[PDB]
Every structure is written in structure tokens, then in C-alpha cells.
Amino acid sequence: SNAIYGYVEKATLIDQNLTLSAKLDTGAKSASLHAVNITEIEKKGIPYLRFTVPTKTGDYSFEGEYVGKVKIPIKRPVVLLNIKLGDKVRTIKVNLTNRKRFLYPLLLGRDAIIDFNGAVDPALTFTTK
């Protein structure tokens, strides 16, 4: 690893310049994002999902490559999402989840933390400053 993040960080979904509080959760493999109004489209025979992220400042619409489904025994779709954490940008697989009960709209699991080459110190928050 080359960075040590706290267990909560601000992360930006760069397509909409949307900064969210994200929990960095080493107990989960997958990343997840609450999203609503999910629709499948095809761009040149490649499936994408269009979806909304709802927030206190209103709704943000995204499109992401539709790369699979995973069981959580509910199956949810997995899309690719461009995410900035500190000065690093990565394209990360995220589950689009239905639950509107939660503290943090974005959860980054082990795969995402590894993509960012990070370790997590749970004594800290918002190390990206």
C-alpha cells in the first residue's frame, strides 16, 4: 500500500462532480452505491445502465458499463464507476443497491481499497483532508 485512509473519506463520482461520504469497509469485497430509477440501454451492442443517485442536494444521473450481477439473496447489477479519492482516480466495480436506510451513500470494499493501493486506519476520518 502507499496510502493510509480513514474509515470514512470524501470520494467524488467525477462524471457529475458529485462528492459523497464513502465508508471504507474491509469486511466487504464489493463496493455499493444507492441508486434509483435504473434502466438498461445499449451503446453499440454494449450494455450500460442509466441510474440516479439521490442526495440532499437533488438527483444526479449517471451511465455506467453493465458488467454483471451479484448476490447480496437479492441479485443487484454491477456497473463501472469513475471515482476520485484524494488525488487518485480509478474505475471501480460498484453494486447498485436499493436500500435507502444507511449512513453513507457509497461503500468501498476490499476490491476498491486495493484498486487505490490503500490501507484503512479506522481511528481516522477524512484524511484526503
Instruction: Please state, as a whole number, how many other Cβ atoms lie within 10 Å of the Cβ of residue 111.
Output: 14
Report the Cα 59 to chain-centroid distance in Å. Answer: 16
**Amino acid, single-letter form, for residue 15:** D
What are the C-alpha distances in Å from 113 to residues 24, 48, 75, 101? 7, 24, 23, 23
Instruction: Please state, as a whole number, how many other Cβ atoms lie within 10 Å of the Cβ of residue 46.
Output: 9
Domain 1-121 has CATH 1.25.50.10: no
DSSP characters over 75-125: EEEEEEEEEEETTEEEEEEEEEE-----S-SEEE-HHHHHHTTEEEEEEEE
State the virtual CA torsion across 111, 100, 10, 87 in degrees, nearest 10: 50
Locate 110 and state its grid cell: 476490499
Antiparallel, parallel or unpaired: β 18-24 and 3-13: antiparallel
* Cβ within 8 Å of residue 74, ≥6 positions away: 98
Locate 106 and state its grid cell: 457509497
Cα separation, 27 vs 6, in Å, equals 15
Q: Where are the domains of the chain?
A: 1-121
Place of cell 450494455: 47
Place of cell 462528492: 19
Cα separation, 34 vs 22, in Å, equals 11
Resolution number, Å:
1.9
